[PDB]
Design a protein around this nucleic acid. Structure first.
Ligand code: K
Ligand code: MG
Ligand code: MG
Ligand code: MG
Ligand code: MG
Ligand code: MG
Ligand code: MG
Ligand code: MG
Ligand code: MG
Ligand code: MG
Ligand code: MG
Ligand code: MG
Ligand code: MG
Ligand code: MG
Ligand code: MG
Ligand code: MG
Ligand code: MG
Ligand code: MG
Ligand code: MG
Ligand code: MG
Ligand code: MG
Ligand code: MG
Ligand code: MG
Ligand code: MG
Ligand code: MG
Ligand code: MG
Ligand code: MG
Ligand code: MG
Ligand code: MG
Ligand code: MG
Ligand code: MG
Ligand code: MG
Lengths: 127, 61, 172, 106, 197, 48
RNA sequence: UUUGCUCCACACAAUAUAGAUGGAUACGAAUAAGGCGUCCUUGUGGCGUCGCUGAACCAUAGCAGGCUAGCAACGGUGCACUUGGCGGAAAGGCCUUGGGUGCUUGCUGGCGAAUUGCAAUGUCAUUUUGCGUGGGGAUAAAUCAUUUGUAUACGACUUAGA
RNA sequence: GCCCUGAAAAUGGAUGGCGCUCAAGCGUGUUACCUAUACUCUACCGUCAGGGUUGAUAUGAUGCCCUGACGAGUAGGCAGGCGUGGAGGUCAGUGACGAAGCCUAGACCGUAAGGUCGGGUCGAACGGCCUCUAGUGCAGAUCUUGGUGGUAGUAGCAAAUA
RNA sequence: AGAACUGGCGAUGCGGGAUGAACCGAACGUAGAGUUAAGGUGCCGGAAUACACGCUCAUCAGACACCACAAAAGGUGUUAG
RNA sequence: GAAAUUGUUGAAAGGGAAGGGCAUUUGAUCAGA
């Protein structure tokens, strides 16, 4: 349903977790670069965690592409959704987290009419 | 490994666009970029380079 | 150094205007290739005459093949070698089919018995002993007796497999 | 007949490795009856299956297969290098693998 | 090539045999070693006894029950030589060692099975003639192994029974060699010989 | 530095550990060497 | 014992597999010596022969091996019985008697196979456990509490109590 | 030359260990083989450099595209970005049909700072973009305040006759 | 402890030297394949219990530079002069 | 109504720490088409 693309290659799917974020609770997992003079991670000794670097950058042709092959576009209403009317093979609409259930029903109906893919069609559905 | 004889990733050290955000100066830069690229006249290239110059490098005449 | 070949190397001590056609000195050098043969030639020429590679030239390098490579010969070899504490001259006798094989055996034997590396050995002379009873080393004389036969006791056959099912025998 | 085998027996020895660093992407296989790289050249390119069993039935069987192939000879004693679609688990060091006769050139 | 390989350790150069067995174990072959008391070590008996006493003097100073254990039996001496060459602290090394059994003599499970030898570890094939060597049973007895006499008596009994079995087998083999001695000039035999059988 | 005065160690290291015996009846750990020409007889007795 | 325990047979479920995919195929001893066969005056004997690896030997054909017709010969092999012996180092195996029964590819036939679609381990093994159905067998202890003091910080130990 | 004597230190221990004796030792020679983030080729990311392309539907000329080379890094410099409180503009943005917050080995995007979504809880506000602004980002400072552990049901609650 | 030149460590990961800031090799974006360096190929441990010539038996053998020591003097031990 | 810390339930592992990196087996779970 999306534009043809090369095989999507992720050079590093594992998250870059901050050093010792598994050792101390106060050290969050959000990546921080070690600045210590003796840091084994900064010095890149074998057996330690890898650090984010530009070499891991994804192919520009497949960058930002979801597994379906679309780029995610956040939509808050029908006017936001309709910006993808001529771009249904490249963009997929994602309804914003704070959209009410009835507005989600309206947006889903409009996206179905316009052939726009919705990444989260089951949010705030009838239970 | 390569025994580099010069600094790697060295920027040219010359301006390639004005530091100014003047839209009209940018339009002039575009016009003289086109002229310098597609005329082969040294005047157009030197004018294009002069359009990049800072204020202290463009003393009043 | 390696499996040896013998080369004749003739060098010149490059001519000048006063002395054209210099005396064309020659050596028989055992070496594994021609680069090493020429290097050894220049080394010994610098040991013998006032000349160096820059002031001379190599006129000819030619491999000398064994005249009778399939005739068993006794060779007498005069060598000079540097030990850890001095320099010594030795005479040894080697039974082989060629000068190159005898010289390889000589280098192996000097390395084994005197820890003499290639760099420490000078081959003074290699000459075939034409007449037996001029062989003066018993370890070669014992191989010149009439109708020499000897067994090879305790034969050890190499197994192609890790395990054997027969408790093998060393008969021969 | 009593025998039905159409593969050569082999043993997963280890991964490709240096003294202290291994490479799980390449496995070393000892093929029965192969003692030289000249012999192993015959088995170059042959498909290999590691066949193992699981408790959970998946797609109509409790037997699962990891497929790979011989890529090149290894060493002087007939060991071969092999690459698999998924690397072997490394609990299979010493486990038996099957080297099939296809793709065949006889 | 067999599910279990039974090596007759007699005269087998304990270190080289241990190398062979360790490689087989790590490659996944089940090995049973019999007659460990008849293994050999190169070097004089006094040399190897002094080596064992140097091993014996090594022990944890503050508690000898923690230090290296000095097993006296020949099978355990071989097992030590083999464990020092298997990565025994890993799960893989533990599995490889579980694939191994070492015995003094030939116990009843294996006295009726084929025993193989390892030529690359055989003393007669490896040691230069005239070099002195030690016998593992004698060394073990000298360093405290208690069962040389019992193993010797049971080995003598087993050899008697095995000699009777082999006399019967040799008689049957003579009968078979007679049976295929005839029927060797038949057309089937000539065709088999033409095909190499 | 050295003990500065020699004295024998206290206690016998061959009676270790100084633990409770596993049973109230001490085990006979060695019986007399068998002399197979003698009549059959007990080698020990139990008393209180 | 809210019908308990154990063993056997079968069925059904799980459960995993340090890793089956024809056979672990048994003298001992020596190795500057032996194995085998044969003969005699029986030995540390004579003669012959062998090794130079198991690259062997056995086994091996049949819808993963079907259904049938014969020929030849009383052989081979499996199964469940059965006679007896031997084996204690961890024996738990080895040998053997008799009959029954299935197969026999030792030889000659007849029928079947297909479409798993050009390959996909294409599932054939053994490890425990549970449950149900039948049959066989048996009908206790330990600990707490009390007590003892040959014991003991507490546990523990040693005793006694229908 | 090798070997041996010369050759004595304190926990038990080190050719790394095992072990190795025509070596798995020593001297020497020849091949084969193993493997670094090194070399060669290719792909992708970024940087730098040299260029092509306003002739339009071309709305991204700081855009698109072509070519080559390069990539270690403390102290440090610079650049491009992520996030927070508040401010101007804008999306006539989101929201009691549920804002913010919080929880969530659930999903997606980014090399990353981070962003987005689903589910639960919840109850009244909040966000995207273009800019402005700062009391704007914590793992440490025997940091400050508050809260909470292991220690640990532990030390112990034994002077003053009961 | 103090100078000279250079190369390094600091600031540097990687393969080897078991282990180690400096040694050897080689300097590093993310991957694939091939080939190697220094070092290795009995087993641990990937790689020949390879080939060839000799030497050594040690009742404290010996086993790779930096480096983790050994000397003078001796030995019908053995080998070659 | 966070975290530290704690109880219960569920899952998993556990021969003198635990935690981590590469790779895959197994179990659980799940997106995209
Ligand atoms: K944390
Ligand atoms: Mg990612
Ligand atoms: Mg530092
Ligand atoms: Mg580079
Ligand atoms: Mg004792
Ligand atoms: Mg004293
Ligand atoms: Mg010494
Ligand atoms: Mg080695
Ligand atoms: Mg050598
Ligand atoms: Mg690379
Ligand atoms: Mg440019
Ligand atoms: Mg950099
Ligand atoms: Mg503020
Ligand atoms: Mg909410
Ligand atoms: Mg959590
Ligand atoms: Mg309210
Ligand atoms: Mg502040
Ligand atoms: Mg804090
Ligand atoms: Mg800090
Ligand atoms: Mg503090
Ligand atoms: Mg505080
Ligand atoms: Mg208390
Ligand atoms: Mg008190
Ligand atoms: Mg009181
Ligand atoms: Mg500093
Ligand atoms: Mg460096
Ligand atoms: Mg070292
Ligand atoms: Mg190996
Ligand atoms: Mg001396
Ligand atoms: Mg509340
Ligand atoms: Mg909590
Ligand atoms: Mg414990």
């Amino acid at each position: 349903a999306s534009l043809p693309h090369p095989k999507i290659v992720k050079k590093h799917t594992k998250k870059f977790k901050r050093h010792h974020s598994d050792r101390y609770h106060r050290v969050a997992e959000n990546w921080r670069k070690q600045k210590g003079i003796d840091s084994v991670v900064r010095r890149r000794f074998r057996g330690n965690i890898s650090q984010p670097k530009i070499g891991y950058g994804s192919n520009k042709k497949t960058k930002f592409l979801s597994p379906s092959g679309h780029k995610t576009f956040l939509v808050a209403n029908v006017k936001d959704l309709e910006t993808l009317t001529m771009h249904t093979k490249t963009y997929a609409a994602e309804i914003a987290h704070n959209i009410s259930a009835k507005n989600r029903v309206v947006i889903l109906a409009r996206a179905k009419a316009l052939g726009i893919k919705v990444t989260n069609p089951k949010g705030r559905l009838a239970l | 490994g390569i025994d580099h004889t010069s600094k790697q990733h060295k920027r040219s050290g010359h301006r390639t666009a004005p530091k100014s955000d003047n839209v009209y100066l940018k339009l002039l830069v575009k016009l003289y970029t086109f002229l310098a690229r597609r005329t082969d006249a040294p005047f157009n290239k030197v004018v294009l380079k002069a359009l990049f110059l800072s204020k202290i490098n463009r003393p009043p005449v | 150094m390696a499996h040896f070949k013998e080369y004749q190397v003739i060098g010149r001590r490059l001519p000048t205007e006063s002395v054209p056609e210099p005396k064309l000195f020659r050596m028989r050098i055992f070496a594994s290739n021609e680069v090493i043969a020429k290097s050894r030639y220049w080394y010994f020429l610098q040991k013998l005459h006032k000349v160096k590679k820059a002031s001379g030239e190599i006129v000819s390098i030619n491999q000398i093949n064994e005249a009778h490579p399939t005739k068993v010969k006794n060779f007498g070899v005069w060598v000079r070698y540097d030990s850890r504490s001095g320099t010594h001259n030795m005479y040894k006798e080697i039974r082989d089919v060629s000068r190159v094989a005898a010289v390889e055996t000589l280098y192996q034997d000097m390395a084994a018995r005197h820890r003499a590396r290639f760099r420490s050995i000078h081959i003074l002379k290699v000459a075939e002993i034409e007449k037996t009873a001029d062989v003066k080393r018993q370890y070669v004389k014992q191989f010149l007796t009439k109708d020499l036969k000897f067994p090879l006791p305790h034969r050890v056959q190499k197994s192609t497999k890790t395990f054997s099912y027969k408790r093998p025998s060393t008969f021969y | 007949a009593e025998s039905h085998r159409l593969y050569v027996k082999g043993k997963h020895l280890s991964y490709q490795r240096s003294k202290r660093v291994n490479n799980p992407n390449v496995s070393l296989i000892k093929i029965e009856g192969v003692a030289t790289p000249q012999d192993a050249q015959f088995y170059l390119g042959k498909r290999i299956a590691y066949v193992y069993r699981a408790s959970k039935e998946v797609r109509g069987s409790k037997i699962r297969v990891m497929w790979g192939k011989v890529t090149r000879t290894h060493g002087n004693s007939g060991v071969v290098r092999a690459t698999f679609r998924n690397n072997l688990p490394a609990k299979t060091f010493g486990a038996s693998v099957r080297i099939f006769l296809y793709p065949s050139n006889i | 090539v067999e599910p279990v390989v039974v090596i007759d350790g007699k005269g087998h150069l304990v270190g080289r045999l241990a190398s062979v067995v360790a490689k087989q174990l790590l490659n996944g072959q089940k090995i049973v070693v019999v007659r460990a008391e008849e293994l050999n070590i190169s070097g004089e008996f006094f040399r190897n006894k002094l080596k064992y006493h140097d091993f014996l003097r090594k022990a944890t100073a503050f508690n000898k029950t923690r230090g290296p254990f000095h097993f006296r039996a020949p099978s355990r001496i071989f097992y030590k030589a083999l464990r020092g060459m298997v990565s025994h602290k890993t799960a893989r090394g533990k599995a490889a060692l579980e694939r191994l059994k070492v015995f003094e003599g030939i116990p009843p499970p294996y006295d009726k099975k084929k025993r193989v030898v390892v030529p690359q570890a055989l003393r007669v094939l490896r040691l230069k003639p005239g070099r002195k060597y030690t016998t593992l049973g004698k060394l073990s007895t000298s360093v405290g192994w208690k069962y040389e006499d019992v193993v010797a008596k049971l080995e003598a009994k087993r050899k008697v029974s095995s000699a009777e079995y082999y006399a019967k087998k040799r008689a049957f083999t003579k009968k078979v060699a007679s049976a295929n001695a005839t029927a060797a000039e038949s057309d089937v035999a000539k065709q088999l010989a033409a095909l190499g059988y | 530095s050295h003990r500065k005065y020699e004295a024998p160690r206290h206690g016998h290291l061959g009676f270790l550990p100084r633990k409770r015996a596993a049973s109230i009846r001490a085990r006979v750990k060695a019986f007399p060497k068998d002399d197979r020409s003698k009549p059959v007889a007990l080698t020990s007795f139990l008393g209180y």
